[PDB]
Amino acid sequence: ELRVGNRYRLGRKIGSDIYLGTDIAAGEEVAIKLECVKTKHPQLHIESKIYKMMQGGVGIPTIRWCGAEGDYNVMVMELLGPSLEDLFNFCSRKFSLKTVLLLADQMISRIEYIHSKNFIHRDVKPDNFLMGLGKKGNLVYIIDFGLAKKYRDARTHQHIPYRENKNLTGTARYASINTHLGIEQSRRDDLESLGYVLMYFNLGSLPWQGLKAATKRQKYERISEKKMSTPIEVLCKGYPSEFATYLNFCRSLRFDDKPDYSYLRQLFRNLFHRQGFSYDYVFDWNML
Numbered sequence: 001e002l003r004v005g006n007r008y009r010l011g012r013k014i015g016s017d018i019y020l021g022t023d024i025a026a027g028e029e030v031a032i033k034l035e036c037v038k039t040k041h042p043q044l045h046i047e048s049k050i051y052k053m054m055q056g057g058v059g060i061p062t063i064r065w066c067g068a069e070g071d072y073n074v075m076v077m078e079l080l081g082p083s084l085e086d087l088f089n090f091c092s093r094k095f096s097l098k099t100v101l102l103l104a105d106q107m108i109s110r111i112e113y114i115h116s117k118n119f120i121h122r123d124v125k126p127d128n129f130l131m132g133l134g135k136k137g138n139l140v141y142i143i144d145f146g147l148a149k150k151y152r153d154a155r156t157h158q159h160i161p162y163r164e165n166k167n168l169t170g171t172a173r174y175a176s177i178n179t180h181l182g183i184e185q186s187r188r189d190d191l192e193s194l195g196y197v198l199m200y201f202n203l204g205s206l207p208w209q210g211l212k213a214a215t216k217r218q219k220y221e222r223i224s225e226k227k228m229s230t231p232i233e234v235l236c237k238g239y240p241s242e243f244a245t246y247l248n249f250c251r252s253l254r255f256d257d258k259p260d261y262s263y264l265r266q267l268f269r270n271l272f273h274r275q276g277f278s279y280d281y282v283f284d285w286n287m288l
């Protein structure tokens with residue numbers, strides 16, 4: 001009887017807001033996102049528009065419903081599996097090289113797809129990639145367009161202008177050095193963030209993680225400084241050279257440069273082949 005859109009039965013809250021739901025018409029399991037209508041800065045209706053523009057892309061979740069009902073703005077999405085962060089903790093924060101490469105291949109393509117649809121994600125983090133369910137269990141999905149920005153005109157492909165003095169929009173742990181410097185984010189920053197996520201998977205933690213400071217402000221300065229002070233060769237020591245090559249390539253991109261996604265994917269595909277890993281989708285979580 002407690003429904004949203006007069007169709008989706010409201011279930012347990014799973015994230016602080018995201019709930020489990022059930023489509024009463026189909027019997028299908030869904031995820032429900034609620035935004036208090038009285039919030040200071042409304043984001044859900046804007047985010048729904050981004051999801052809608054992304055529909056049809058590989059690993060883009062389907063948006064089933066959106067609207068305002070009582071005290072909330074509502075968005076209903078198809079139910080997906082756990083996030084890569086949930087899976088990483090489930091695997092005791094250690095992923096094998098094979099799993100990192102299988103993930104890298106799909107994550108680069110998800111980012112490329114968002115960029116082909118004229119947006120930058122701006123919050124590339126393990127928490128924002130989810131595995132599918134059932135038959136789509138080997139498919140990596142990208143979520144959360146709350147911080148996404150249009151970087152180019154849909155018609156002309158004119159890139160947004162270079163701008164400085166920007167607030168940190170994203171997670172400090174994975175932010176590109178340009179983001180720390182307050183430079184307007186662009187295609188390169190989503191890819192650089194992905195490079196840190198892959199190194200976080202390789203290492204189990206990042207060298208600028210767990211830094212202590214009196215305030216959030218001083219904490220972000222310490223993360224920024226530590227990230228600046230750590231050469232890519234030091235960060236990637238003891239891991240295949242492809243991870244350093246990937247990161248140097250992303251840091252070398254100019255503000256409005258179109259990244260070579262095919263080259264970056266091929267670096268990791270060539271390493272997968274050289275390693276002699278089996279061509280299956282047996283991730284580390286399937287070995288537990």
Ligand SMILES: OCc1cc(-c2c[nH]nc2-c2ccc(F)cc2)ccn1
Binds near residue numbers: 030075076083144
């Ligand atoms: O793992 C179950 C699961 C979680 C999520 C999820 C995790 N963070 N945010 C969402 C979400 C949910 C509904 C929505 F409309 C938009 C975003 C989505 C789908 N399936």
